[PDB]
Amino acid sequence: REIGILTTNKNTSRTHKIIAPANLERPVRYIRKPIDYTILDDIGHGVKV
Amino acid sequence: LQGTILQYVKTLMEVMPKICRLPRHEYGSPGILEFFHHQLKDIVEYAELKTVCFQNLREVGNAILFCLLIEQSLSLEEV
Amino acid sequence: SQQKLAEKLTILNDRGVGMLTRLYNIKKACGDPKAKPSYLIDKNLESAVKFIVRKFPAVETRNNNQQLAQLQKEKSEILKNLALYYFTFVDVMEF
Amino acid sequence: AIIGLYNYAHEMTHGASDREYPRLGQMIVDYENPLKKMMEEFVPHSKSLSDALISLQMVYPRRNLSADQWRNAQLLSLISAPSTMLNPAQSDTMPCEYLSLDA
Amino acid sequence: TRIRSFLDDPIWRGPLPSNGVMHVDECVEFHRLWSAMQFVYCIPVGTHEFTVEQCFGDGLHWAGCMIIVLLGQQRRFAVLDFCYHLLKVQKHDGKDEIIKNVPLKKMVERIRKFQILNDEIITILDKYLKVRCFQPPIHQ
């Protein structure tokens, strides 16, 4: 008890060298599309056509 | 800390320069050394510095080092 | 006011960066001999590819002169593996 | 090789070349020394491009200084003038200050 | 922490900065006094005398760096320091002469050694110990 005055809990924890995500980066396919010039008209004061 | 060291700190604070800029690179290394040596002349020539201030500072540092090392040894025996 | 210069510029810049990425990957895949398409290294297609390249813009199927006989039996595969590269080049042209 | 070989496969399978083969081949054979053609292609745009480029005299040369000139101006130093450590750093051409030099 | 509780005198921390951020060219804080003392004991001595590490060892620096760190002045000390500044400039221009019987190259070498030691001590002390916003201008 006498020595306990000078003490304080130290923060040390166990961990792993690497921790992986719950769900990995599932890859996605490349689907070709043409250049669509009408995809920014809902941002700001758009000018449709 | 609240005794002799405090008094020497107060005295040397009185003796220290009021303003001290860090010169620019263009001033040179020799010029900067000369400037520093001129500005801190009173501290450099203080006789009691190395024989009293440093002694008390050494005492304080030795005390804290002893606390650290004794804690390490205690842990090593506990394990 | 109907030119939509801002939007057109914004769209085309992203498109250009994407095309650059794709074309860089095509270049890298075509550089190392162990990753280019299998048809550019086969020994029996060498004559066919040399003939095709020697007159690239023009198509001269009929009157092949047996410089394309081999290519006529892997066509279902040629047309199915080189599709990605061809359409990347097409998209470069459209951009 | 890739373009011609795909086009031939398509021709043999269907009897007609792909839609885009003619223009695609023309592009490929035109930009074989791409800069020699792109130089002739940008004569019409010369005036506008020149304006946009001459506009850079006010940003490039002063951003491309040496290290000695940087030391003289004490660039990026908070403590150079301690009396103005709260003033907001600002300039008229704010975006031009952190624009990549390689670009 | 207990030792930090002992530095309650106002001399250690000084008065509030004029510009409202931090002192730069003033010498009213303990870390500038310690910079001056460092300048004092980084000067080469005569053969008939004893060096600081011959007489005091490493406890002197442990005490000084502890005082600096507890007051929270470690980073200001690193930025603002006469010896470190001299070392930096001399490294830049690579000069070597004698000023008031103090060789320059030897002095910078000693300064570098002590810089290494001080960095180590400060790092250990920081390890064992584990915002003032400002207003933008107002239009007249």
UniProtKB/Swiss-Prot annotation, chain B:
Component of the WAVE1 complex composed of ABI2, CYFIP1 or CYFIP2, BRK1, NCKAP1 and WASF1/WAVE1. Within the complex, a heterodimer containing NCKAP1 and CYFIP1 interacts with a heterotrimer formed by WAVE1, ABI2 and BRK1. Component of the CYFIP1-EIF4E-FMR1 complex which is composed of CYFIP, EIF4E and FMR1. Interacts with FMR1 but does not bind to related proteins FXR1 or FXR2. Interaction with EIF4E stimulates FMR1 binding. Component of the WAVE2 complex composed of ABI1, CYFIP1/SRA1, NCKAP1/NAP1 (NCKAP1l/HEM1 in hematopoietic cells) and WASF2/WAVE2. Component of the CYFIP1-EIF4E-FMR1 complex which binds to the mRNA cap and mediates translational repression. In the CYFIP1-EIF4E-FMR1 complex this subunit is an adapter between EIF4E and FMR1. Promotes the translation repression activity of FMR1 in brain probably by mediating its association with EIF4E and mRNA. Regulates formation of membrane ruffles and lamellipodia. Plays a role in axon outgrowth. Binds to F-actin but not to RNA. Part of the WAVE complex that regulates actin filament reorganization via its interaction with the Arp2/3 complex. It is found in: Cytoplasm; Cytoplasm, Perinuclear region; Cell projection, Lamellipodium; Cell projection, Ruffle. Signal peptide: none annotated. Breakpoint hotspot for the Prader-Willi/Angelman syndromes and may be implicated in autism. Commonly altered in tumors. This is Cytoplasmic FMR1-interacting protein 1. Belongs to the CYFIP family. The gene is CYFIP1. The chain holds residues 941 to 1019 of 1253 of the full protein.
Swiss-Prot record, chain C:
It is found in: Cell membrane; Cell projection, Lamellipodium membrane. It comes from the Eukaryota. Disulfide bonds: none annotated. Expressed in all tissues examined except peripheral blood leukocytes, with highest expression in brain, heart, and skeletal muscle. Expressed in cells of various brain regions including Purkinje cells and dentate nucleus of the cerebellum, CA4 region and dentate gyrus of the hippocampus, and in frontal gray and white matter. Part of the WAVE complex that regulates lamellipodia formation. The WAVE complex regulates actin filament reorganization via its interaction with the Arp2/3 complex. Actin remodeling activity is regulated by RAC1. As component of the WAVE1 complex, required for BDNF-NTRK2 endocytic trafficking and signaling from early endosomes. Belongs to the HEM-1/HEM-2 family. Component of the WAVE1 complex composed of ABI2, CYFIP1 or CYFIP2, BRK1, NCKAP1 and WASF1/WAVE1. Within the complex, a heterodimer containing NCKAP1 and CYFIP1 interacts with a heterotrimer formed by WAVE1, ABI2 and BRK1. Component of the WAVE2 complex composed of ABI1, CYFIP1/SRA1, NCKAP1/NAP1 and WASF2/WAVE2. CYFIP2 binds to activated RAC1 which causes the complex to dissociate, releasing activated WASF1. The complex can also be activated by NCK1. Associates preferentially with the first SH3 domain of NCK. Interacts with NYAP1, NYAP2 and MYO16. Interacts with TMEM132D. (Microbial infection) Interacts with human cytomegalovirus protein UL135. This is Nck-associated protein 1. It comes from Homo sapiens. The gene is NCKAP1. The chain holds residues 9 to 103 of 1128 of the full protein.
UniProtKB/Swiss-Prot annotation, chain E:
It is found in: Cytoplasm; Cytoplasm, Perinuclear region; Cell projection, Lamellipodium; Cell projection, Ruffle. It comes from the Eukaryota. Coiled coil: none annotated. Component of the CYFIP1-EIF4E-FMR1 complex which binds to the mRNA cap and mediates translational repression. In the CYFIP1-EIF4E-FMR1 complex this subunit is an adapter between EIF4E and FMR1. Promotes the translation repression activity of FMR1 in brain probably by mediating its association with EIF4E and mRNA. Regulates formation of membrane ruffles and lamellipodia. Plays a role in axon outgrowth. Binds to F-actin but not to RNA. Part of the WAVE complex that regulates actin filament reorganization via its interaction with the Arp2/3 complex. Component of the WAVE1 complex composed of ABI2, CYFIP1 or CYFIP2, BRK1, NCKAP1 and WASF1/WAVE1. Within the complex, a heterodimer containing NCKAP1 and CYFIP1 interacts with a heterotrimer formed by WAVE1, ABI2 and BRK1. Component of the CYFIP1-EIF4E-FMR1 complex which is composed of CYFIP, EIF4E and FMR1. Interacts with FMR1 but does not bind to related proteins FXR1 or FXR2. Interaction with EIF4E stimulates FMR1 binding. Component of the WAVE2 complex composed of ABI1, CYFIP1/SRA1, NCKAP1/NAP1 (NCKAP1l/HEM1 in hematopoietic cells) and WASF2/WAVE2. Belongs to the CYFIP family. Breakpoint hotspot for the Prader-Willi/Angelman syndromes and may be implicated in autism. Commonly altered in tumors. This is Cytoplasmic FMR1-interacting protein 1. It comes from Homo sapiens. The chain holds residues 1098 to 1248 of 1253 of the full protein.
